[PDB]
Design a binder for this molecule. Structure first.
Ligand SMILES: O=P(O)(O)CC[C@H]1O[C@@H](O)[C@H](O)[C@@H](O)[C@@H]1O
Ligand code: ALF
Ligand SMILES: [Mg+2]
Ligand SMILES: [Mg+2]
Length: 218
């Protein structure tokens, strides 16, 4: 049986993928780039703050100073951090709180494998911190999603092999990161976005311990 579940945060635990999208699009438009629509945003899900800004600049062939780059990333983060102040336990996605409870009852380790430096704050806002056996610090890894490092680190932090772990993701980049870690991915979203080659569920109510077992037994 699997021994750990490795959670992405944004778009898996709560609806903060929407907030990142709104903040990045606002930033992009302030600098005169309007290609950041929902379709393009599928390339931004899972990607670090600086990598996201670079993808937006590259979309437009735009070349800012190092000083401006730093200011833009900070501006977007400051806006995002204001957006999330009112996140609460009521914003936890369907199924997720019960999944965490059921995993703990079955002695399955729970680790956060999020790129977000705002992750710990968000788990506290949602009264979820106590469910997590570890939070992999995304500043510690040498390579960000789609590299597998953050999922490998999350599994290591709870003493479980990636190959005995399930990863939960809503992003193209994150699904690739899970694949390359050796863990088993279960995506949440549209197969049109996430692929026809892994198990995908349409919403997080599908993330039950029963279903994770169903999939693992395979
Ligand atoms: O470090 P932060 O700026 O809080 C978030 C860094 C990245 O986290 C990921 O979980 C999201 O899918 C990305 O959209 C985001 O860019
Ligand atoms: F949506 Al994440 F790390 F929380 F990619
Ligand atoms: Mg996500
Ligand atoms: Mg604790």
């Amino acid at each position: 049986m699997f021994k750990a579940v490795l959670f992405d945060l944004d778009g898996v635990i709560t609806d903060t993928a929407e907030y990142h999208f709104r903040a990045w699009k606002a930033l992009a438009e302030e600098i005169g780039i309007n290609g950041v629509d929902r379709q393009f945003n599928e390339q931004l899900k899972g990607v670090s703050r600086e990598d996201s800004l670079q993808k937006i600049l590259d979309l437009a062939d735009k070349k800012v100073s190092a000083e401006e780059f730093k200011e833009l990333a900070k501006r977007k983060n400051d806006n995002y951090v204001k957006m999330i102040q009112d996140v609460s336990p009521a914003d936890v996605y369907p199924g997720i709180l019960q999944l965490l409870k059921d995993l703990r009852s079955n002695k399955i380790k729970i680790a956060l494998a999020s790129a977000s430096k705002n992750g710990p704050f968000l788990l506290e806002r949602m009264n979820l911190t106590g469910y997590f056996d570890a939070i992999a610090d995304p500043a510690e890894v040498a390579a960000s999603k789609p590299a597998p490092d953050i999922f490998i680190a999350a599994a290591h932090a709870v003493g479980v092999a990636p190959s005995e772990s399930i990863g939960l993701e809503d992003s193209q980049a994150g699904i690739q990161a899970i694949k390359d870690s050796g863990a088993l991915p279960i995506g949440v979203g549209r197969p049109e976005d996430l692929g026809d080659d892994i198990v995908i569920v349409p919403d997080t109510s599908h993330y039950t311990l029963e279903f994770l077992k169903e999939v693992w037994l395979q």
